[PDB]
Swiss-Prot record, chains A, B:
Residues linked to a glycan: 21, 66, 85, 98, 140, 281, 404, 421, 577
Name by which UniProt lists this protein: Glutamate carboxypeptidase 2
Catalytic residues, chain numbering: 369, 567, 602, 625
Gene Ontology BP annotations: C-terminal protein deglutamylation; folic acid-containing compound metabolic process; proteolysis
Originating gene: FOLH1
Organism: Homo sapiens (Human)
Domain note: The NAALADase activity is found in the central region, the dipeptidyl peptidase IV type activity in the C-terminal.
PANTHER family: GLUTAMATE CARBOXYPEPTIDASE 2, N-ACETYLATED-ALPHA-LINKED ACIDIC DIPEPTIDASE
Recorded topology in the membrane: Single-pass type II membrane protein
Length: 686, 686
């Protein structure tokens, strides 16, 4: 009973069976169907052999369209007539036109409203897009409806950016330039987005809070909830998404200024005029939104399975991914959840033969991830003390594939070595690499920008269920999935089905199987290796990289750094110290008795934990990791030394430079202190 | 080598020698003399046999009078003449009239100013005193100088209360009714306060922040400091203390309303008129303060000694007390520090013979405790990650005696059993109890208000160096000292000398020796017992007591609890659960292998830690313990369920009752959740 045994028990055919089983009806959070799937998963995980399997439920704020009062957008003429209306549903996929309860496209958590106004086209609605509109083009968004294309950044950042600019409404759409791959056919004949396809998705700005009504505390039966008016993260203007057929109708009459350059033009046969408003003929027509969605406190259910550790049952390695989907979830998330199900099945087969892992493994099927990571965050708020004193690692398990080209890993530097070592022992599934390792194919296809002969591994960002574990609690975290050659066209649409995956992404299920071996093999090592498989020297390498980068951003303002005596010396000193201490620690780790071992492993487990500042980042108390936080411009992207980065952002625009530069210095001191403090956790303990 | 060996090595004669050595010159924080004593202590602890002994220094905000521009108060006539002036120094004690650098009486951190006005007498300046003045007597303090007597509550709460009432100055004084014991002579002929004696002391309201300029982070060499304007906890009006000779001069001319009752009258031959202002003859005279003290960032030094553990070197038991004193520190703190020095000496004797404790013991000599607990708090901010993952217990060691009657212990319920068991094995030093245990004499003299045949043990409050460890970090903490039959007259005066202790408090040093056996024996057990000597069942008992108490406070408002559906059921359910789970845990602890042991001990060590809410209490982010916080009316006193207590305080005065009662419910939910969460840390781990 070893890792090879675990890995050999995983079967592509089983992943395929489970994916099919998980994707025949929609499993939207808060619905009957998703409770039923949770019950099924709990039953099967027990049958698979876990020691215990429980549902953990919470009553959280969710959001749904009004069934009898649909959401839509109009062009209205001056007479008041609605002369063009967007579509009320996506044409359902072949063979699914009778499935009940497909939720129509909507932006979850939109407030209600029927605003009317002139359209302004804001490109991707990124921070830089609004800067370009307002500062360079002198175009004023206040009181206008903005239309923005999806992509580049999390949609919630788009809405926040629109709000701050004074917009009274947001219309989101998928441009073929971003969601239609050239040379491939639309679903059902290929994997491309049809013009009637629409990306659903929440538009919250929770900054890691979880349920908007109970930030800090689990939404259990006796919770005291904020009123809607004080809820965290809800947008203050109506928002609705549409497909590119409808978008074309809204964009074609656009007047005002031309697009500032070609980076602002998508693929529709439309000028991409920024506005405000329409051209001459139609300058009297307007855009009207009709949004009637309601926010509703609704029960959600996590499935939590436990495989007790033989030696350190009080040390937890967690494999977690969500189960709730927008409609059928053929990729998002069931391609990940089917992989988790087969991982549980394999571990349980070993267990039934008398094996147990050294440490406890917890398996999680999270609910309401699509509505703001609510299920993972509420459970972690409930269990925060257990997690912070016992949590070894968290491996996420959302969609296993978003392409069929190569591997994509985003993790803490603590697991870089683990990931290199594991992938060297796994067979590549790729054409042209038969008989060669996954490591070889991945490094060949996705080389490191810095080191020859190594693969790219990215920082963790946010916007998935690892966020509370890593960014709030400081538990070492990672994720891995197959990706494209550098999202995917049918993301969050009704066309993400079992057939999309089985026909176009992974017909042999070999990419699913490889991802199962990576996620499963990581959890196996973390739960069974005698010494935890973390290399602190890898952190010392990246900290230097990030310190160089942040210093180079500051050095765009040399005169201000002289005037205000802005020095990075403390941060560099801390990083140098971390490097030296980590080096000594690594020598002792190889050169040593279970208390020494357990004292040692605790140093490795609490090293990620040491980067947490209990005071949080400014105005973001649930983002506490001083090295990594979600980017303030794009929740999906990771930022390093985010406190310093945000202090320096757009600093030349601040009215009181002394105060702005003071706050940069304050952030340098906080970062330097935290790096040194983390380093000292690796010093000899007495 | 066992506890008896440790205890027998402690000698009364050595405590006496060290006390004498520590009290011949003043050791005010930030001065040359106190750095020299720190160096001496470090040298001796090394000689005593500790493994390492370091100074940990920080640059913190301190406050000192201006040497060439003394602080004083006047009665000024309408002509502008200063017709009476308070004294510029206390008459120094016999044989010490040539000692240099005795700091004159002042209120540390007072701002500068020379306000003039009418006096109002505010009794003890407690919350209830100001309520009585303003609501019942209709006396308006705005723009008036208040005169208040020391006692009952921390002086800082007095100043905060005066500020909030609109006072422009505060004069603090020691009334004989509170600081002169009947039938005993004044120093040097007895232990009573002479009329020229004055209590020094800081008047900050830091709420656990430590150095006013660097809340959250150590005041190290690269720290970025707040400006004085944003500093935490500084008073906004001038404050100065005086003795009762001077107080009599200021109080004798007082007019306006009579004292509302006899609880408002002290012992001076004065009417205790509340004012405002003086009687007819002198109604045109005024009181003028002259305060010229300056706040100065100043280096302070902690001495940190380590005795490495043989088995769990990564588990810390800390014995810490301060070294800085107002003048000679004959009781405060050197009676405690001399005890610590002899404890270190005894442990080092065992070490020199080849013994080591099971866990690491850390010994601390803290600086600048008198200026706001700055040395212990900065070191704990520096080492917070080590402390929270490794800190087993903190035993404080300030003044060993404040009387010669009986023992006084204030601790976490987790150490109640430890304290009972230890004191049953110690000989009582008391007259009439020769041959009988310390337990027997203490319970006889200070019985429990609740259980026959047990002694009183009180909650921890704050205002001493355990505050950061217990209230911020959640490390189990305790303190013990000999006390009077229910502060002490010469507290913080120049008369607290070696002679006061050797002549009047403890001439045989037997009370010092007994306190050394208690503090030392507690640290020995905590550092050496195989299973940590904490009983979680004791916590379950007090939690029920506190839940009953807080419910009984709320039930003063039955109509409001019906209207707003204010239920305590969740809190009672949590406490019941904690009781049941603790009971099972205790059974397993007696019924079990070093990992099981270490997994078990970790449950005991992290149990205090589980009562910490990382979000802090409302507007008090550094007070994080949900069960215990310093009282918002008296930093010295402990409050239980302080979040709920403060929500209910004076609630019938709140203008929006729906909102006030909502916040009571929110606090009940937070408390219930935290109790249940702490209970679940004692559940089986998987
Ligand atoms: C990386 O690791 C280093 C440990 O090897 C550590 O070095 C410490 O650095 C601090 C400076 O930040 C040193 O502080 C000095 O301590 C001595 C006493 O040991 C003091 O005398 C000295 O006094 C001052 O001199 C100042 C500087 O010129 C002056 O401004 C002051 O007013 C005062 O006169 C300093 O406070 C400490 O000793 C060092 N330990 C060593 C060298 O072994 C680094 O700080 C660490 N990096 C970080 C970010 O922590
Ligand atoms: C002390 O320890 C107890 C464990 O023995 C624990 O008991 C749990 O209590 C909660 C109630 O707070 C129970 O919650 C219910 O869970 C079931 C499913 O297991 C739900 O069906 C049920 O649904 C609801 O019924 C509600 C109440 O009438 C209603 O308002 C809702 O809308 C919904 O229909 C409840 O959510 C849980 O099962 C209990 N575990 C048990 C009994 O074993 C205590 O909560 C704990 N005390 C604290 C403060 O944690
Ligand atoms: C997915 O697979 C499960 C497990 O086999 C199916 O659930 C079972 O359905 C059978 C036949 O109705 C019942 O006898 C069992 O009680 C079910 N087992 C459970 C819930 O654990 C489930 O119906 C399948 N779903 C689809 C769409 O094929
Ligand atoms: C990844 O594999 C490398 C090569 O096997 C491991 O590094 C070796 O670890 C052993 C065990 O301590 C050492 O004795 C060798 O000297 C190491 N070889 C090196 C550094 O080249 C590495 O530990 C593995 N990473 C893990 C387990 O996280
Ligand atoms: C307190 O005791 C210490 C320790 O004996 C005395 O310090 C020593 O003084 C002698 C005589 O001057 C020196 O030779 C040593 O170098 C000192 N030892 C140290 C500093 O560790 C100290 O002087 C005593 N103080 C008083 C007031 O009696
Ligand atoms: C205090 O002393 C009592 C009496 O010795 C200790 O309680 C006993 O502990 C032993 C060891 O587990 C048990 O076998 C006995 O049943 C206990 N006696 C009781 C409960 O009456 C108690 O453990 C000690 N407290 C400590 C060490 O914190
Ligand atoms: O939908 C999500 C969050 C974002 C997805 C990543 C993602 C983010 C954006 C796109 C897109 O714009 O097409 C596609 C995928 C993840 O982290 O798995 N979770 O279910
Ligand atoms: O002076 C102090 C803080 C308060 C003291 C307790 C104390 C508190 C008040 C008095 C008094 O009013 O006479 C006396 C003693 C302690 O906690 O040791 N620390 O050095
Ligand atoms: C949906 O449709 C209409 C909107 O006014 C109304 O009858 C019904 O209350 C709505 N449902 C909600 C708000 O859940
Ligand atoms: C848009 O829908 C509204 C409401 O149902 C209707 O009055 C109008 O005729 C529609 N416009 C078009 C072009 O269908
Ligand atoms: C832009 O928007 C509206 C135009 O109606 C105007 O009232 C507002 O004050 C303008 N503000 C800025 C900052 O340009
Ligand atoms: C699957 O891989 C092939 C081979 O390169 C590629 O052409 C095709 O685009 C891939 N399918 C998807 C959905 O990426
Ligand atoms: C103390 O005395 C006077 C007050 O104005 C002045 O000469 C000197 O600056 C003062 N010292 C300080 C502020 O430290
Ligand atoms: C009080 O002191 C001031 C300043 O030194 C002086 O002018 C005045 O004479 C003094 N008053 C008395 C009564 O000594
Ligand atoms: C009380 O104080 C002063 C008296 O000069 C007055 O100006 C102030 O407004 C009064 N306020 C209250 C609340 O009684
Ligand atoms: C010391 O104890 C005696 C004996 O009861 C008592 O009368 C005296 O007041 C005590 N001294 C002090 C300072 O308490
Ligand atoms: Ca919550
Ligand atoms: Ca500080
Ligand atoms: Cl993932
Ligand atoms: Cl004490
Ligand atoms: Zn997903
Ligand atoms: Zn998704
Ligand atoms: Zn003291
Ligand atoms: Zn004191």
């Amino acid at each position: 009973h070893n890792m090879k045994a675990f890995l050999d028990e995983l079967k592509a055919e089983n992943i395929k069976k489970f994916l099919y089983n998980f994707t025949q009806i929609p499993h939207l959070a808060g619905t009957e169907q998703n409770f039923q799937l949770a019950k099924q998963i709990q039953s099967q995980w027990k049958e698979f052999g876990l020691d215990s399997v429980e549902l953990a439920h919470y009553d959280v704020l969710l959001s749904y369209p009004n069934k009898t009062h649909p959401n839509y957008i109009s062009i209205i003429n001056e007479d008041g007539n609605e002369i063009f209306n967007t579509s009320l549903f996506e044409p359902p996929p072949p063979g699914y036109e009778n499935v009940s309860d497909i939720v129509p496209p909507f932006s979850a958590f939109s407030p209600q409203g029927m605003p009317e106004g002139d359209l302004v086209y804001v490109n991707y609605a990124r921070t830089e897009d609004f800067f370009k509109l307002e500062r360079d083009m002198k175009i004023n968004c206040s009181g206008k409806i903005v239309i923005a294309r999806y992509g580049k950044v999390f949609r919630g950042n788009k809405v926040k950016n629109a709000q701050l600019a004074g917009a009274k409404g947001v219309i989101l759409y998928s441009d073929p330039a971003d969601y239609f791959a050239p040379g491939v056919k639309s679903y059902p004949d290929g994997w491309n987005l049809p013009g009637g396809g629409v990306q659903r998705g929440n538009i919250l700005n929770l900054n890691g809070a979880g349920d908007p009504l109970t930030p800090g505390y689990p939404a259990n039966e006796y919770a005291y909830r904020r009123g809607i008016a004080e809820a965290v993260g809800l947008p203050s203007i109506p928002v609705h998404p549409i497909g590119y057929y409808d978008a074309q109708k809204l964009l074609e009459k656009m007047g005002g200024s031309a697009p500032p350059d070609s980076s602002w033009r998508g693929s529709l046969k439309v000028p991409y005029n920024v506005g405000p408003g329409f051209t001459g003929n139609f300058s009297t027509q307007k855009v009207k939104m009709h949004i009637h969605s309601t926010n509703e406190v609704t029960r959600i259910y996590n499935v939590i399975g436990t495989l007790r550790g033989a030696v350190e049952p009080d040390r937890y390695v967690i494999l977690g991914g969500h189960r709730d989907s927008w409609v059928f979830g053929g990729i998002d998330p069931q391609s990940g959840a089917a992989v988790v199900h087969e991982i549980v099945r394999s571990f349980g087969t070993l267990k039934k033969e008398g094996w147990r892992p050294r440490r406890t493994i917890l398996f999680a099927s999270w609910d309401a991830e699509e509505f703001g990571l609510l299920g993972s965050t509420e459970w972690a708020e409930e269990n925060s003390r257990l997690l912070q004193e016992r949590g070894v690692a968290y491996i996420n398990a959302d969609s296993s594939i978003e392409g069929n080209y190569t591997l994509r890993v985003d993790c803490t530097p603590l697991m870089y070595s683990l990931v290199h070592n594991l992938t060297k022992e796994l067979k590549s599934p790729d054409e042209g690499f038969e008989g060669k390792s996954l490591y070889e194919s991945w490094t060949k296809k996705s080389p490191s920008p810095e080191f020859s002969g190594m693969p790219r591994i990215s920082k963790l960002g946010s916007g998935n269920d690892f966020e509370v574990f890593f960014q709030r609690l400081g538990i070492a975290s990672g994720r891995a999935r197959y990706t494209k050659n550098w999202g995917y066209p049918l993301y969050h649409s009704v066309y993400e089905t079992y057939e999309l995956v089985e026909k176009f992404y992974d017909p042999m299920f070999k990419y699913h199987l490889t991802v199962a071996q990576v996620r499963g093999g990581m959890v196996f090592e973390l739960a069974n290796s005698i010494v935890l498989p973390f290399d602190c020297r890898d952190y010392a390498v990246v900290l230097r990289k990030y310190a160089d980068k942040i210093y180079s951003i500051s050095m765009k303002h040399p005169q201000e750094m002289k005037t205000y005596s802005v020095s990075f010396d403390s941060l560099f000193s801390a990083v140098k110290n971390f490097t030296e201490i980590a080096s000594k620690f690594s020598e002792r780790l190889q050169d040593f008795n279970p208390i020494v071992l357990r004292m040692m492993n605790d140093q490795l487990m609490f090293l990620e934990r040491a980067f947490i500042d209990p005071l949080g980042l400014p105005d973001r108390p649930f983002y506490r990791h001083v090295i990594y936080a979600p980017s303030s411009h794009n929740k999906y992207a990771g930022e390093s030394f985010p406190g310093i980065y945000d202090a320096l952002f757009d600093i030349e625009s601040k009215v009181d430079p002394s105060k702005a530069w003071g706050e940069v210095k304050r952030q340098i001191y906080v970062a330097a202190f935290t790096v040194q403090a983390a380093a000292e956790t690796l010093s000899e303990v007495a």
